[PDB]
């Protein structure tokens, strides 16, 4: 049975650095954990899979190679993505009173 479709909307959590460093400690320690290199496949998979399970939002294959460091992972996860259609993006954008938009699709 198909589960309810996962909404692609994602708002980065406020305690995101804390959660990320907790996961980094769980997976891997030294000072400046931002600069920990993910050249190891095991460690990269563990960290990214944990983050994907926890936040409901995975790094796409296209961006997977540019996650060279925990800093890169943090940058990827602190950028929001909204799944609202263009209809919503326009209508909920403070339309002037003389502008009317309707969608029949």
């Amino acid at each position: 049975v198909c589960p309810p479709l996962r909404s692609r909307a994602y708002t980065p959590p406020e305690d995101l650095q804390s959660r990320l460093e907790s996961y980094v400690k769980e997976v891997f320690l030294p000072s400046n954990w931002q600069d920990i290199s993910l050249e190891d496949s095991r460690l990269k998979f563990n960290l990214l899979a944990h983050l994907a399970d926890d936040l409901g939002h995975v790094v796409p294959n296209s961006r997977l190679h540019q996650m060279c460091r925990v800093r890169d992972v943090l940058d990827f996860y602190n950028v929001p993505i909204q799944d609202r259609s263009k209809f919503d993006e326009l209508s909920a954008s403070n339309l002037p009173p003389n502008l009317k938009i309707t969608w029949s699709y």
Binding site: L90, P96, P97, N98, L99, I101, T102, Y105
Partner: protein, 148 residues
């Protein structure tokens, strides 16, 4: 050609400049398709320019249908009842912007040959010429060769 085309005289709608200027464009209707390359420029215009145009022209009600019939279009309705339909098929964002601004600037009067480049309701201040202007009068109004 002029002879194979209707013509009119220069005119305004309701003496549009005497007391105040009233923008004659009152309604714009953009029929735009979600999919279809023909309305890509229209989609970008709706995304980037229609809001600014709407707030620049508060007297014009703008509708965006997002489901057209045939080609994507903009229907401009004017105060005098004129309806001008312009296809925005395969037009770029800037092309559509210029077209919409032209619709906003023009009046609803037909774009046909205009007979005169001017229109006066009072062409004469000193009195229109008639054959008896500049003609001197004669004593007792005697016409030429009149005996008395």
């Amino acid at each position: 050609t002029a002879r194979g085309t209707p013509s009119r005289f220069l005119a305004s709608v309701l003496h549009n400049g005497l007391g105040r200027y009233v923008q004659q464009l009152q309604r714009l209707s953009f029929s735009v398709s979600r999919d279809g390359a023909s309305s890509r420029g229209a989609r970008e215009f709706v995304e980037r320019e229609v809001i600014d145009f709407a707030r620049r022209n508060p007297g014009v009600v703008i509708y965006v249908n997002s489901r057209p019939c045939c080609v994507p279009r903009v229907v401009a309705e004017y105060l005098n009842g004129a309806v001008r339909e312009e296809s925005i098929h395969c037009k770029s964002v800037e092309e559509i912007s210029t077209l919409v601004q032209k619709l906003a600037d023009q009046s609803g009067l037909d774009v046909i040959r205009i007979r005169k480049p001017f229109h006066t309701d009072n062409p004469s201040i000193q009195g229109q010429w008639h054959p008896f202007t500049n003609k001197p009068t004669t004593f007792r109004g005697l016409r030429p060769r009149e005996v008395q």
